Design a protein around this ligand. Sequence first.
Ligand SMILES: Nc1ncnc2c1ncn2[C@@H]1O[C@H](COP(=O)(O)OP(=O)(O)O)[C@@H](O)[C@H]1O
Ligand SMILES: Nc1ncnc2c1ncn2[C@@H]1O[C@H](COP(=O)(O)OP(=O)(O)O)[C@@H](O)[C@H]1O
Lengths: 899, 899
Amino acid sequence: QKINPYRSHMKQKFQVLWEKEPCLLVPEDFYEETTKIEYELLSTVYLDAESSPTVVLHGPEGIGKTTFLRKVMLEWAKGNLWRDRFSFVFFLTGREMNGVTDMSLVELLSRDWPESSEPIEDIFSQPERILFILDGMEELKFDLDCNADLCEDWEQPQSMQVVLQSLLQKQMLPECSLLLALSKMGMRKNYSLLKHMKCIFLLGFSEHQRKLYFSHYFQEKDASSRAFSFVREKSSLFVLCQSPFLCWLVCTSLKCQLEKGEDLELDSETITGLYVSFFTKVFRSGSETCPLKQRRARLKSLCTLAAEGMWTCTFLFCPEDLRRNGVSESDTSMWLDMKLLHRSGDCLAFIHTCIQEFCAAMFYMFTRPKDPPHSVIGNVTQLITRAVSGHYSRLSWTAVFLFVFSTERMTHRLETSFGFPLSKEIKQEITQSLDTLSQCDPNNVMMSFQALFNCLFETQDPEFVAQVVNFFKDIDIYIGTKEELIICAACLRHCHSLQKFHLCMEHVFPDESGCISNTIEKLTLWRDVCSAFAASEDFEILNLDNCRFDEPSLAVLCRTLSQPVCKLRKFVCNFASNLANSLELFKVILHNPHLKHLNFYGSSLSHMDARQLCEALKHPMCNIEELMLGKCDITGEACEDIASVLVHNKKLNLLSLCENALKDDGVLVLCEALKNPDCALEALLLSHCCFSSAACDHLSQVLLYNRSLTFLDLGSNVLKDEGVTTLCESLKHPSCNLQELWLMNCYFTSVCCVDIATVLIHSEKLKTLKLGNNKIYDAGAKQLCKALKHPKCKLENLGLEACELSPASCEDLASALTTCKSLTCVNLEWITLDYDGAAVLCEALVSLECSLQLLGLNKSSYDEEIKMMLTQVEEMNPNLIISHHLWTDDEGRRRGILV
Amino acid sequence: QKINPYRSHMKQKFQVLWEKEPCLLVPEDFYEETTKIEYELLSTVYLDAESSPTVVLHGPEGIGKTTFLRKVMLEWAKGNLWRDRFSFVFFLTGREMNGVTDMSLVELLSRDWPESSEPIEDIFSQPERILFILDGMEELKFDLDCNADLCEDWEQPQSMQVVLQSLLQKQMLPECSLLLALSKMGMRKNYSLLKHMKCIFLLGFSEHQRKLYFSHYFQEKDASSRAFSFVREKSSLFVLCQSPFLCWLVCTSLKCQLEKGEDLELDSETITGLYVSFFTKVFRSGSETCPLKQRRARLKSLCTLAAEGMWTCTFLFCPEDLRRNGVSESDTSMWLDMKLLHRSGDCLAFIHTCIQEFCAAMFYMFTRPKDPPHSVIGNVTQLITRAVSGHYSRLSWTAVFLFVFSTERMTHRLETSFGFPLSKEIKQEITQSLDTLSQCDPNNVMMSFQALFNCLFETQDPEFVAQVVNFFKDIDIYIGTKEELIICAACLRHCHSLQKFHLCMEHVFPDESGCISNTIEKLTLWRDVCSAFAASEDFEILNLDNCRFDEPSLAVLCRTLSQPVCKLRKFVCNFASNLANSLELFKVILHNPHLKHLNFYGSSLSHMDARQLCEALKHPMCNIEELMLGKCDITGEACEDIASVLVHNKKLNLLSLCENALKDDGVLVLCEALKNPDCALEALLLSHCCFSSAACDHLSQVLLYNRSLTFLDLGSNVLKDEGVTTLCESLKHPSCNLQELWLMNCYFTSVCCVDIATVLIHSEKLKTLKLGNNKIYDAGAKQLCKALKHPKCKLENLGLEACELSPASCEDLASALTTCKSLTCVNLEWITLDYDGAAVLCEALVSLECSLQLLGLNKSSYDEEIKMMLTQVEEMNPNLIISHHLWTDDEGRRRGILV
Ligand SMILES: Nc1ncnc2c1ncn2[C@@H]1O[C@H](COP(=O)(O)OP(=O)(O)O)[C@@H](O)[C@H]1O
Ligand SMILES: Nc1ncnc2c1ncn2[C@@H]1O[C@H](COP(=O)(O)OP(=O)(O)O)[C@@H](O)[C@H]1O
């Protein structure tokens, strides 16, 4: 074996770690039996020396991930693993790293690197010979994202977050290999960050392995047989015993019950029940020579220790910390003996992070509603808020425990088992906290309804679940497993408060011959979820984002929405249309007179699909007033059918066909439908429809003959001034009812600006004009400003944003703002400014004659002097807002593009 | 609505049916509430008047399928449904149909058709106006398959099975519509038969509907509240109450418990537990003023009635039937009062088929091992065999019940509740019956391991399950759901008796980024199933038939097969090969020295996939002696690697590369590999490899230089006479070691027959030659016969099948058979014969000089005189077997095509 001092140092260090850290040391042959498959998988998956992947050790908490990583490193350091694949392996743990504030990868590695050896840069000469093991990533004080930039230099000092994110995204030592340990929650959290992923699942014990674990814990035989028989007779307990840590919990609980002499009782209704039984019986069997008052004081001090640790993302407790939280030497000895704490060096740690979270939740059970703030540990409202708001999701398990503790049954269990009283105001605290969150603005909060639903589900309190869920009106949820379907059905079964529902569902209804695959249980759960749609008589918006149905599930949803009791108003079905989908959605459209807005943005339709859609719309039970079909792959032939709808449904008044390819023959057919002075359509959006000036002829005949059409969007079309001139000739006559015109990015120039200037003088009805993103090069600007100076131009909103404007237009713009009394909004973003033009513009802006309410300008993108001038403008005209990105979101929403 | 007398007749019929059949008549508004979605879905899905679809009413037993179909027919006949879509709907029920033995569709329809109405041909004039409702298909005396042909004429008399299967496959009135009622078992049974399926699932009650049903059954309020509270406190009972029939069972059980006055106790461990509680409590509450002897005799008589009904597929009981089984008027009144039976006209029927199956299973509890045969009711051995043999699978639920009854706990429960003794030899009867079944030939007695596993699973007896499953050595199983995975894991956890395992697995491991999708539970179950492969030190053959894995499940399987304790010998992986499949399957190949046969037939490979396969095969831990790569999309370039294998692996001696496209350059490279007098390959099959005479040159150099190669298959290649003559030139020299040559379907003719005729005279080692399916005429046959008459021709097997042979060859054939003393097998199928040549052939065949053991000929395809002559031949030469399809299955198996 090659001489290596670092390898031997790690051998000694992890040999010592392997023998005293775990809850119970089992014979090594047993451990090797229990994890044989995973060890072999790892050893062969890394022998690759095209690229090397990052392998994630996947499993639930307490399954033994950290133990497996330590065994792997110990076997490598002894020379028994990766002998000819990795020369150096580094073991990084999250809690030890959290202490590091500002360090480079080299310094962190140097921490455990003996000087009497090779240098670190020399070992970095060959990066593929390095493996990084990252254990306890979920215990980090920061999140991992691509938000922060990622440097590629190991020598250069950086914050530890940047080092980890660079290592993970492979922008730092790309040749090295990564070994991650993640739970299901961590897997879902960091799936986006990880690429080229390879997974190894830990499986825990089998039934024979559970028997052997019991035989190893109980050094006798007959009581071991008794305990195994008792746990086997109960199904849920045996199922939970697959996890070695839960198995050890059950062992210690039963061992206390047996050494006490009591009969074998155990609670396995929930995981929280097993935790409560373990903690209860260890406390009773480990504290008997102590009076009740000091028992309560000691437990409360320990729980405060855990709560402070969890709120500061700390899991190692120096003696000074125990003294601060009121934990004395006697208390430390007692908890070490009863095996809720163990040493992790010179410091102490909880036997497992889950036990620490248990005590942290327990801490709130000693509290009063009118308690002074701890200034470190947040109160119940803060904990609930941080746990059900998606940004952090750090104190999740704690909150879950607290939810379960707040039930009357479990508060009773806790009080009876401990012997002292505990707070019963905690359910009310949680309820009021969730109500307060619900009454907040849904956009500013970003609720995580998966987290809230999990917490509610664990209480098994249907009335509590109904009360809490009915506080919320705008709900969004992802369903991709049966577990999440069960939880969502439980939480929404008795929900009658829905306003907006956003749903994404995958992996549940495959429709691979849905007859054989779908089950009555799945349909019943789905029907229960749908019951909220028809039971909530406040239901405005249903947004189905990339959902995957089969015929029965879709039929259930459509029949739910068809019921006359349903009050749906907006149906937003993104990217979904087939033959049976057509049939069922047409049942939806027909049956409901309350449904008025329909947005199919993105769903690629065919000729027959559009034919069937229009045939369903022509039914006289259809009250659709807004129809958005953007990016539906609609073409000219389908226009033949759409025109038909315009003839029949006098209730329809807004139609958007953006991002399609009408190609002037569809526009011809649509103008043929529109010309008839029976079509009641009031708003038309044909943005980016790949048509030209040829259609502007026919559209002109529309403008003369429609007394209902008031809004036209023709942006992103090649009009080349002939189309704009034809339309302007049509719009010269005041009898036209057009109010709003959008011709942005239409590839015209100054030449047609004269004709526009004519309509501005003759129209008494055109109030909003967007001519932005066109190269008017100050000639069009000068002509339009002179037109606006006319004492008959009733124009209210003008957009010339990003029009190749220069400081020469300023003066002429400055004179329009002070003369057009009806002009209240002007978009001039991306104009290039100097001092001599910014001064004139600001003089205009601060004037009483200037009747402008909204100015579109990008203040940040200028020098300091002009920034100071615009700030002075803001402080001298208290009615004017200067801002950029004025109309982007409004344009997207009205076109139907965003949603 | 059009006037119709048939409609009114069906209205009266189903109106009478609707009011007396059900267990409890609920208000009609309640029923319509409980089935609103399904009714609307049917009504709107059929209004479409393109092909006609088959609509299936899907749900578990007792969910209300028959009730829903009857209400649908009543509403149709009342004019409230399908008023403008169907003119005539026929309601076919299995039990009523079973009485018909041999009748046509017209007569069966006329059965319930009044004469004073329209004619049958006139109503068949427009088939589009016809709907068929098929209820109780699982209660048929015959099975439904596609084996029998399907005629399109309704007038022609046929057996009812043929009419029904033609109706289902739409080869009889294809324009008609179908409405089927099926269970999960029936759905999986008949999925193959049905096409264009449409499904409507019945959902049963919701929670509020369960409350309302309780309030409706219990006409008071306080016990309704008490019953609902008790059922709600128990999870399993509430879950089971979703089914209306199970809900009525629970209602009656609780009603007996309350009117008796006892506390509310109920066992809900299994569905069989609920049935036992219902039956026990109904019997106790309905026969208490009766002495024990007559209680037991009455229950036994009812059980006998049920048993005769189940074994004769009868479910309506005329009074003579009750008298024959010993059921009197007093007994009928008692059972009607306790609501185990109800009237269905002048006759009685069991309240539900499930109750009848329950009683039929109960009947065996009154029997003795040494009992005389009932001559109608089969004994326990016959019942178990018919239940776990796939051919019948009719009495499944009965057997399931009997299994649960046979446990000690449930026998104790039944004895305690009833009060009289019951048989305790039934576990032994079933175990011995299954042992005897296992010792039968696995090819004949078609076990249905899904049925056996379900029966074993329901007993919840791990020891009994292990004992029964270890009786079987050859197991084949399909896993397509999580339920079936759980069942197979439970049954195979402690199985260590495996010899051959055939597996087809779908729909469980999607590999849609298996990290997020796969769960530890599923992986654990799969590992438990795989544990049988490595725990059974007799494991010969593992056949994965079109299985679909992800990385973790495949890795679990491969690591299982890698263990040195594993004794795998034959690995048949049909239709699976990718890059990750490559890595893991190479772990399988490398690790195991016991593995010797490898068949990848059907798995589409690529250039690099074949490269990686060959590189894995070149490892020196590889003991493969047989390699089958038929229909693997292998081409000439991959031969370069394949040739390498032939050079390296001195253990390999059989290679089959059939159904590939080698195209003479691959064959060139392979012959370059074979020429080397180190290649130990002994048998090569290049059938259907798309090569020509150009390869026969190189193959010739093979036969001179390979002292180990003894079998060559070159069938179905365009070899013409030049290739065969080149090969014969190579094989003339006695130094060639070739023992078997297959040149069937090789497009040669009489011209090369001279050279073959030379080799037959000069070879001392060529024992089997197949020249079938080649257009050698009687001239070639005569030349070969003259060769065989030479006193040096040591040819043992000759195939001249399908060679355009005529009665002129007979004489020359007849004289070769009596001269070639070494010629023991000759295939002459498809030869045309007359009397004067058949006589010569038979005179040869019945002769002492004829040393033939096997003659390949199709006796059935000749006139009566020649048939009688060949029958006399068989009756005069007791050593000669005449048969057709002589070598087809052997050819397929040896090429690796079949399996
Ligand atoms: N295979 C095993 N055999 C015996 N004990 C185990 C095994 N796996 C885990 N344990 C015990 O369970 C605990 C698992 O905790 P840990 O190893 O931190 O897993 P995780 O990080 O997944 O929670 C350890 O304290 C160890 O004592
Ligand atoms: N929707 C329902 N509402 C109330 N009771 C029902 C309903 N469906 C079925 N039942 C009851 O359940 C029992 C079983 O009915 P059945 O239609 O025979 O089930 P299946 O057709 O599945 O065998 C009947 O006695 C009936 O009274």
